[PDB]
């Protein structure tokens, strides 16, 4: 399982948010911590992506593009997984020092979005998702959103996406027997993958509005976060860049 060896081998390690928990919760502090966590996580996601099989085939501008458009979903999907494995989806485990309970979900002023994310975490349990299926689905998420106008070199991207989908089928096919199970399983995983986009979309809208009024609510946005959310995210919210869905 060469391909699986790579995903397993390059999977990012634990990342902390640097949150002061001995300090009373507040909107400004929580969101500022989540943002810092984004900056820190982005760094790992970039190093992770550049190490994926065939990623370097993509044109350099397209490499940065898919990462800049997919980080939200990637991060949310991995966050859901940690929440499932660490606390069986009891809370949102953003980081070791940033675990969201119902109080924080509410205090973050993004309770509805958090509920959305916890529900995704629950799915990992309800579908009995394997660590390997998780890994393969996550890799596939990096290639699940592109500009309606296409990429610099769409042809390579298309080839790459086709291969990662082919790998997901392999994972499903192995350790299995019933051809009806393979198809059903693929149906469920693609359904799950699609369910990530609406959550990402809601978060994009939220962080965008947050960046705009950040100065008023006293929320901090690190360099890369401020740049990406003001330059790349708007392209998604305006319909110029959209998710690739399996199902209609
Ligand atoms: C991606 C992060 C940080 C990494 C993670 O574990 C998922 C989580 C989802 C909510 C995001 C947060 C980064 C900072 C954002 C974008 C805030 O501005 C509003 C929504 C937050
Ligand atoms: C490839 C790449 C993507 C990206 C996003 C934010 C900052 C730097 C980056 N390099
Ligand atoms: C996942 C993946 C398999 C593979 C084989 C050849 C070239 C690129 C590839 N990506």
Six-digit token pair at 172?
Answer: 């499903």
Q: Tell me which residue has its CA closest to atom 9 in ligand 2.
A: 64
Confirm or reject: Cβ of 206 under 6 Å from ligand 1: yes
Q: Which atom of ligand 3 is nearest to the CA of 53?
A: 10
Between the CA of 71 and the centroid of ligand 1 the distance, in Å, is 10
Cβ neighbours for 237, distance < 8 A, ≥ 6 positions apart:
204, 205, 208
- What are the angstrom distances between the C-alpha of 69 and each of 54, 77, 161? 19, 14, 15
Q: What is the rounded CA–CA span in Å between residue 98 and residue 175?
A: 36
Q: Which atom of ligand 2 is nearest to the CA of 228?
A: 6
What is the SS3 assignment for 180?
helix
Q: Tell me which residue has its CA closest to atom 3 in ligand 1.
A: 38
Q: What is the rounded CA–CA span in Å between residue 142 and residue 231?
A: 19
Between the CA of 69 and the centroid of ligand 1 the distance, in Å, is 14
Q: What is the rounded CA–CA span in Å between residue 63 and residue 201?
A: 21
Q: Quick one: 9 exposed, middle or buried, by C-beta within 10 A (0-12, 13-18, 19+)? A: exposed
Q: What is the rounded CA–CA span in Å between residue 118 and residue 83?
A: 8
Domain coordinates in residue numbering, the chain: 1-248
Helices 154-173/60-87 angle, 10° precision: 30
Cβ neighbours for 210, distance < 8 A, ≥ 6 positions apart:
31, 217, 219, 221
Q: What is the rounded CA–CA span in Å between residue 117 and residue 178?
A: 32
Look at the domain 1-248 and name its fold. Retinoid X Receptor (1.10.565)
Q: Quick one: 238 exposed, middle or buried, by C-beta within 10 A (0-12, 13-18, 19+)? A: exposed
Cβ neighbours for 167, distance < 8 A, ≥ 6 positions apart:
3, 136, 139
């Amino acid at each position: 399982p060469i391909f699986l060896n790579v995903l397993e081998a390059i999977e990012p390690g634990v990342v902390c948010a640097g949150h002061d928990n001995n300090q009373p919760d507040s909107f400004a502090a929580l969101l500022s911590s989540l943002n810092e966590l984004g900056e820190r996580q982005l760094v790992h996601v970039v190093k992770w992506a550049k190490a994926l099989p065939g990623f370097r085939n993509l044109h350099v501008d397209d490499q940065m593009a898919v990462i800049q458009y997919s980080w939200m979903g990637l991060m949310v999907f991995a966050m859901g997984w940690r929440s499932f494995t660490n606390v069986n989806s009891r809370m949102l485990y953003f980081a070791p020092d940033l675990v969201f309970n119902e109080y924080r979900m509410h205090k973050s002023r993004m309770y509805s979005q958090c509920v959305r994310m916890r529900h995704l975490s629950q799915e990992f349990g309800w579908l009995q998702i394997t660590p390997q299926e998780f890994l393969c689905m996550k890799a596939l998420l990096l290639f699940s959103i592109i500009p309606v106008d296409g990429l610099k070199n769409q042809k390579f991207f298309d080839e790459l996406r086709m291969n990662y989908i082919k790998e997901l089928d392999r994972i499903i096919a192995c350790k299995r027997k019933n051809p009806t199970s393979c198809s059903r399983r693929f149906y469920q995983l693609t359904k799950l993958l699609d369910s990530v986009q609406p959550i990402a979309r809601e978060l994009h809208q939220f962080t965008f509005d947050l960046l705009i009024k950040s100065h008023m609510v006293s929320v901090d946005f690190p360099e890369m976060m401020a740049e990406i959310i003001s330059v790349q995210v708007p392209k998604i919210l305006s319909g110029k860049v959209k998710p690739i869905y399996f199902h209609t």
